[PDB]
Design a protein around this ligand. Structure first.
Ligand SMILES: [Zn+2]
Lengths: 105, 49, 312, 149
């Protein structure tokens, strides 16, 4: 699926998933053993950075709007990285538009 | 891509499509706001159908 | 996961469970649950020795139920090591299973056909088999007994006379037991499967360990024309809602744009009029509303980590 | 303070907290099904806190509900896994031996033989896989290359 995949966080391998059923949508990374769990609310994310396809690294960063919070995820397959990146882009853009509307009104 | 909407057009959409009104009334105050609802509706396959 | 993927996984599981031991089932089930799996990760997962893992991997590789992929990995703070990964190449595995099933069935059928033939003869001393035709030319001058050539001893009739029913029973049993594979192969033939590669399999990887030493990545060398045997295979939507103030502002902006457009296409001032005589060019209601509202209210009352990054 | 002891405030007791709270085959099956990886659960720590475990594990092995890795010196259950497949025993040794005897032909020649026998081959021979004086300079650094439209 496009809502889950393998990812590495803080040098720990695990599974990253995107929970959209519960509002607001949140991105949750769980280690393989389950000892480590991380959850980030996408409403806080300001910008979405991604490593170029011409580099051996498959990193993807989410910077939170304000010492701004920074979340880094490393992927294993470029196809998985792209499939996750498009889905994340959609949600980030929608949340930014919602914030813009709220501020304007 | 930018799409423009107005209050009159929103009312026309609700009048012409009762399903949209049904999904709007039960969700606008509960889960997400009207802008997010409209964006999701436009991105959804329901609008295409 | 596609339904054809599920079907082929079930076929592989059944074949391994039925035609192989238990450790084979463990290894192949691990490599089916996960994508390409490193040797160390497999060893840690199954808690089996290298010597024990050896025969299993070797037999599965000979049967082509598991493929191998060796690549050089360079840890940032350790000597590089060539790590071995194990995965399943579905087309090759399916072809091997199909061929082996056909061969087994053909072998049993040929054995039945051979057993249906006459028995033959055997020599107790030299333990030599003689067909009926070959024995017919060795009988003694008395036409009483068949004599061996090397031993000059009477021959003994061969066995397998009574197995005629046993072989048929074996075939009947085997077909029933092997029924599932045939149906799975029918569905597989109906569908089309794409050949798997190390990189492709990495896309479905479930990490075995939190800090597995093996780097589950495929970084091919640049401009490497070397070819190894059997190493190749065949928007954003934004919505804007308007209000009355925005409507009046929009009409005002449209009017301004029209004015700018007409100015852009308008003729210049010098061309508009003949400039001969010019010097040559060179260097209160609010209280009224309030009382209205009060009076109407009275009326109503009365009535009631720094690196390259790309923005996206 | 230790994590291996559970406190009961109803009576004020200190009870042992087993690693895997398993006291029934149903619990064992669900616990094995809940695993997110293929790492077996050790019988050494499963046996602790369970008066009998080998009997239940063998009962499930005969029923093909779980996969059991047994010791070599003597039959004794070790790390077990969930059996995602069917029956663990469904083919006779008389046929297993024939399967072992059958030897696969050369990889490059297998598809041709399968096609000759009328069976659709799901592969191809790898040999067939075809691999596949600038005049003005004061404007330098200004002109973008609109080469195509
Ligand atoms: Zn003889």
């Amino acid at each position: 699926m496009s809502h889950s995949g393998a990812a590495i966080f803080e040098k720990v391998s695990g599974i990253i998933a995107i929970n959209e059923d519960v509002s607001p949508a949140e991105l949750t990374w769980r280690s393989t053993d389950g000892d480590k769990v991380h959850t980030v609310v996408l409403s806080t994310i300001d910008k979405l950075q991604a490593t170029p396809a011409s580099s051996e690294k498959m990193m993807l960063r989410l910077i939170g709007k304000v010492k701004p919070q920074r979340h880094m995820f490393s992927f294993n397959n470029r196809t998985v990285m792209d499939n996750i990146k498009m889905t994340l882009q959609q949600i980030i853009s929608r949340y930014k538009d919602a914030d813009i509307y709220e501020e304007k009104r | 891509v930018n799409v423009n909407l107005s209050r009159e057009k929103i009312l026309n959409i609700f009048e012409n499509y009762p399903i949209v009104k049904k999904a709007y009334t039960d969700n606008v105050p509960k889960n997400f706001k009207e802008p997010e609802f409209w964006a999701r509706f436009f991105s959804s396959k329901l609008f295409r159908k | 996961d596609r339904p054809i993927d599920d079907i082929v996984k079930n076929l592989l599981k059944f074949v391994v469970r039925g035609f192989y031991g238990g450790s084979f089932v463990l290894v192949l089930d691990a490599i089916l649950f996960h994508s390409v799996l490193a040797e160390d990760d497999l060893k840690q997962l199954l808690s089996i020795n290298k010597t024990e893992l050896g025969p299993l991997i070797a037999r599965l590789r000979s049967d082509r139920l598991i493929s191998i992929h060796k690549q050089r990995e360079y840890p940032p703070n350790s000597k590089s090591v060539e790590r071995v990964y194990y995965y399943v190449k579905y087309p090759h595995a399916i072809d091997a299973i199909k061929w082996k099933v056909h061969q087994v069935v053909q072998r049993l059928k040929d054995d039945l056909d051979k057993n249906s033939e006459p028995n033959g003869y055997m020599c107790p001393i030299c333990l030599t088999k003689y067909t009926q035709l070959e024995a017919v030319q060795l009988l003694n001058f008395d036409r009483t007994e068949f004599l061996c050539s090397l031993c000059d001893e009477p021959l003994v009739e061969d066995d397998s006379g009574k197995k005629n029913k046993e072989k048929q029973d074996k075939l009947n049993r085997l077909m029933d037991q092997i029924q599932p594979i045939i149906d799975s192969l029918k569905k597989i033939d109906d569908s089309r499967i794409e050949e798997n590669t190390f990189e492709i399999a990495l896309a479905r990887l479930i990490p075995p360990q939190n800090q597995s030493h093996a780097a589950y990545t495929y970084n091919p060398k640049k401009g490497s024309t070397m070819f190894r045997p059997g190493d190749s295979a065949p928007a954003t939507l934004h919505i804007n809602i308007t209000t009355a103030s925005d409507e009046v502002a929009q009409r005002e902006l449209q009017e301004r744009q029209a004015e700018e457009k007409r100015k852009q296409n308008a003729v210049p001032e010098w061309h508009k009029q003949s400039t001969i005589g010019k010097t040559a060019l060179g260097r209160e209601e609010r209280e009224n509303e309030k009382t209205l509202n009060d009076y109407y209210a009275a009326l109503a009352k009365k009535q009631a980590l720094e690196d390259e990054f790309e923005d996206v | 303070k230790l994590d291996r002891i559970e406190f009961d405030p109803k009576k004020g007791t200190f009870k042992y907290l087993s690693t895997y709270d398993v006291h029934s085959p149903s619990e064992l099956l669900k616990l094995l099904r809940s695993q997110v990886t293929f790492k077996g659960i050790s019988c050494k720590d499963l046996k602790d806190g369970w008066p009998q475990c080998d009997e239940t594990i063998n009962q499930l092995e005969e029923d093909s509900k779980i996969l059991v890795l047994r010791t070599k010196k003597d039959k004794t259950p070790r790390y077990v896994w969930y059996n995602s497949g069917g029956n663990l025993k469904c083919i006779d040794e008389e046929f297993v031996k024939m399967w072992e005897n059958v030897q696969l032909p050369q990889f490059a020649e297998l598809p041709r033989k399968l096609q000759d026998l009328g069976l659709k081959p799901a592969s191809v021979d790898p040999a067939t896989i075809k691999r596949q004086k600038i005049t003005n300079t004061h404007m330098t650094g200004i002109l973008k290359d609109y080469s195509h439209r």
